[PDB]
Design a binder for this molecule. Structure first.
Ligand SMILES: [Zn+2]
Ligand SMILES: [Zn+2]
Ligand SMILES: [Zn+2]
Lengths: 114, 34, 43, 263, 65, 125
């Protein structure tokens, strides 16, 4: 009955932008991005590859509620250093890390055969 | 042994499942010598 | 249309025609699916 | 070699062990998750039943047909039924299957995974094939018929991931483990006499060197080298289970960039 | 009620191993746990998936239509 | 899972865990009224506020037909209606319709409607 259609765990709706940037009024030079249709698959991953950003101050995420596939991500960075860039510099760092795993698994994999 | 007397057909070979689906009584019969 | 249990034959008559089985002798009588291909989710 | 390194321990058509050297746990886990749920796979989604006289109800046989594995090697060239432009489905988003079954033999007549034939065009891409790992090459046992039972249905498969429903789950179980000797203190063992003796050393224990008692625990140690093992139900081979797990997570973090420049 | 296609808590396919598991004891006459073990079921959620299941469909197809 | 409730693995439900079948069995008969005037099952021309259309012209639904809300699973006439609507609270799929007669010879009807129940947030175990 009152159960949401399974696909609303990843398929966006009318107008929903995957990401929505809001400025953390509390502490300056901080932002909170509302990732729509995502979870700890991405949540915990981006937060961790943000912590390694030398010029990054705060990095956390909470899944507002397990019903609704969405999480807020708060990011703070050293003065001037745009946090939106800190997310980009953290993201590519993940993909570039990921891409090397793929190619290092593919070669290691292409060898063994049993 | 349980039979049922229906409207036309008289002696019906009444079984449990039969009466269970058809909504009849699993009724045997009583006969005695006066 | 209709069917039967013990005989498991395709009696299938029309209406108002003595609710009874062809040869059998017991009034079972089912009803049989509509040819309407019904859809189902695979969950 | 290039950063996040790998090392294969064992590998087969079903299971695949491997060690991940120099990798972030928060990442590796996120790959385990992607592998489980968000890898694309094919399976039945709509079952039109022409005639079913079986002891199993319609949707009960339906429920499983999707649960049955379908070929999915070249799945990336079959659009999501929802993303395509056709009324309902077609050949560029669905793979029609037909399963006709009449039991002549007085001996009970089994309906299997093999018994479904495709009534659509594949376009020369591996898809829709009922993955049969069977010993006697029969597949998954769907039904059982008597002397005159029957079963006529038509299955329309579609692209999907385990999130929509775990019947699109290309992975089975994902063996996850790291730091076999609890050097990082990531769990406070439970015991009524001895912690070590009551808990068995894991299989992946010979790979890390023991703790060496007379030592001072180094907080500076971090999670490294993760002992994994991914199984494949079949839908996708155990290389692509990890290759597309790595690769569809890529696209996740990359589509975050896609909308990042739209802001 | 018939072999469950794919194990509940794994995803492991186990709908195909019924008449194999069954014949691993009728024919080969093995220990149930050793049969499960030979049918490739290391994780016990699969083990229970076959072991606890009763194949009631067989007692269904005994009736007529 | 707090306060003695539990967390269910949806992955395992999707794979079939604790999936229930459900059945319901509506019944009706053609009543006899003195001067041999009797009821009759049929699509009529009073009527019930639900969708008669799923009926056939023998006043019945054939198996394998989805049904919802106050749909009619049995049309009857005492015009003068006695049609049997579906349970206002269930959404099922017709499974098997039976027709025989009483120990009075009354045309006797039993509709069976099938649904698969699925472990939901709130279900008891
Ligand atoms: Zn008959
Ligand atoms: Zn299409
Ligand atoms: Zn299992």
């Amino acid at each position: 009955m009152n159960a949401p259609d399974r696909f609303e765990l990843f398929l966006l709706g009318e107008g929903e932008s995957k990401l929505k940037i809001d400025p953390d009024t509390k502490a300056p030079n901080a932002v909170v991005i509302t990732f729509e249709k995502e979870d700890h698959t991405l949540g915990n991953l981006i937060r961790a590859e943000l912590l390694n950003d030398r010029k990054v101050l705060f990095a956390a995420y909470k899944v507002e509620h397990p019903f609704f596939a969405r999480f807020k991500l708060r990011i703070q960075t050293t003065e001037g250093y745009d946090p939106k860039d800190a997310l980009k510099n953290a993201c590519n760092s993940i993909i570039n890390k990921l891409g090397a795993l793929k190619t290092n698994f593919e070669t290691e994999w292409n060898l063994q055969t049993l | 042994k349980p039979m049922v007397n229906e409207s036309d057909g008289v002696t019906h070979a009444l079984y449990p499942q039969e009466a269970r689906l058809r909504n009849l009584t699993y009724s045997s019969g009583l006969f005695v010598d006066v | 249309k209709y069917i039967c249990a013990e005989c498991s034959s395709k009696l299938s008559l029309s209406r108002t025609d003595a609710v009874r089985c062809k040869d059998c002798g017991h009034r079972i009588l089912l009803k049989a699916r509509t040819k309407r291909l019904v859809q189902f989710e695979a969950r | 070699e290039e950063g996040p390194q790998v090392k294969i321990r064992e590998a087969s058509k079903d299971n695949v062990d491997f060690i991940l050297s120099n990798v972030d746990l928060a990442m590796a886990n996120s790959l385990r998750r992607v592998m489980i749920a968000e890898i694309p796979t094919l399976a039945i989604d709509s079952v039109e039943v022409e005639t079913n006289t079986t002891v199993l109800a319609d949707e009960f046989i339906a429920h499983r047909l999707g649960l049955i594995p379908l070929q999915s090697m070249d799945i990336e060239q079959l659009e999501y039924s929802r993303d395509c432009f056709c009324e309902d489905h077609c050949d560029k988003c669905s793979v029609v299957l037909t399963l006709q079954a009449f039991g002549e033999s007085e001996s009970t007549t089994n309906v299997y995974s093999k018994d479904l034939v495709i009534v659509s065009n594949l376009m020369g891409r591996n898809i829709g094939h009922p993955i049969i790992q069977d010993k006697e090459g029969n597949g998954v046992l769907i039904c059982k018929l008597r002397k005159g039972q029957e079963l006529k249905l038509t299955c329309v498969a579609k692209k999907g991931i385990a999130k929509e429903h775990a019947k699109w789950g290309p992975a089975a179980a994902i063996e996850f483990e790291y730091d076999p000797w609890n050097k990082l203190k990531h769990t406070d063992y439970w015991y009524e006499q001895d912690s070590a003796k009551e808990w068995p050393q894991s299989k992946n224990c010979e790979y890390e060197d023991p703790p060496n008692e007379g030592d001072p625990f180094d907080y500076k140690a971090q999670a490294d080298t993760f002992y994994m093992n991914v199984e494949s139900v079949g839908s996708i081979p155990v290389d692509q289970v990890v290759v597309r797990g790595i690769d569809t997570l890529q696209k996740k973090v990359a589509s975050i960039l896609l909308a990042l420049t739209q802001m | 009620m018939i072999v469950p296609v794919r194990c509940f808590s794994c995803g492991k396919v186990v709908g195909d191993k019924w008449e194999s598991y069954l014949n691993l004891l009728q024919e080969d006459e093995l220990d149930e746990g050793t049969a499960l073990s030979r049918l490739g079921l290391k994780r016990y959620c699969c083990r229970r998936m076959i072991l606890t299941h009763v194949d009631l469909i067989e007692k269904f197809l005994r009736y007529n239509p | 899972n707090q306060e003695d409730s539990m967390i269910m693995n949806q992955s395992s439900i999707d794979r079939g865990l604790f999936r229930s079948l459900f059945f319901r069995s509506y019944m009706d008969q053609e009543k006899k009224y003195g001067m041999s005037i009797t009821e009759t099952f049929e699509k009529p021309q009073r009527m019930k506020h639900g969708t008669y259309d799923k009926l056939d012209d023998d006043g019945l639904i054939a198996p394998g037909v989805r049904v919802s809300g106050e749909d009619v699973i049995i049309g009857k006439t005492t015009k003068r209606d006695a049609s049997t609507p579906l349970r206002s609270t269930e959404n099922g799929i017709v499974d098997q319709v039976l027709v025989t007669t009483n120990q009075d010879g009354l045309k006797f009807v039993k509709v069976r409607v099938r649904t698969t129940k699925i472990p939901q947030i709130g279900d008891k175990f």
